[PDB]
Amino acid sequence: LSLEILQIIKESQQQHGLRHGDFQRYRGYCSRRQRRLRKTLNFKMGNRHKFTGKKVTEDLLTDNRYLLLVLMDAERAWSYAMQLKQEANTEPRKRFHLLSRLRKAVKHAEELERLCESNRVDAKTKLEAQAYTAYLSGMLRFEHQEWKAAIEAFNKCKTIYEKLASAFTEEQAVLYNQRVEEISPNIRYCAYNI
């Protein structure tokens, strides 16, 4: 139904090491959270000695929790990419795996976006996921030095964030304004690089 992806990710990253710049602990926590969610809802991927490719269909979205699985997959991919960003200063080889991982991060984001097109999901989650996917696509295109698509995605995501902030009270719009302030320097730097 209705979910607050931004609130969940903000409450998760600010309390699991990322508040001071720690990515190993956040990645470990995300992996443990994914494992616990898989065990809790009986979402086993492969049995003993065998593996089967699972899929999140619209029929099983009635639990209002399978969104968190794909969200945590995307968050883990993003954390891995930003972790390799730190170690890419002295290891030039890490960049290829960094980009190969963020390319799958955008795939996870677009999967979580496309699974929300059904009527079982309210209008808030769809718009929030669209903003998240736009931000992720912009980050991906910026990291590959593609400026036009990155700035287009950044414009879309900031427009959605501003509309969402205007839709609510000023007490709760602070987080959306913070996200806008976080993404503005990237847009300005990309424009300056041109």
Add this chain to the structure above:
RNA sequence: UCCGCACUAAGUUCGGCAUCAAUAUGGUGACCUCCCGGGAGCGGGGGACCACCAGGUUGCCUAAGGAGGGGUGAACCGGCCCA
């Protein structure tokens, strides 16, 4: 505050399975094919295909696929230096 309770929500600890590919250059090891010379052992030069290591741009790649570290390397079947 007590519960052999129910599920949701985070961590301790121990096992099992699996852990990618293309492109440019150079190198090693098998095998194949063109030559020049020589009274032998052979010497010099050019290519086709496979495996691997280091290492630069990448992906119609996955739930992921480190350019990580170690050991065995066997019966004579990885070669090197070979009494």
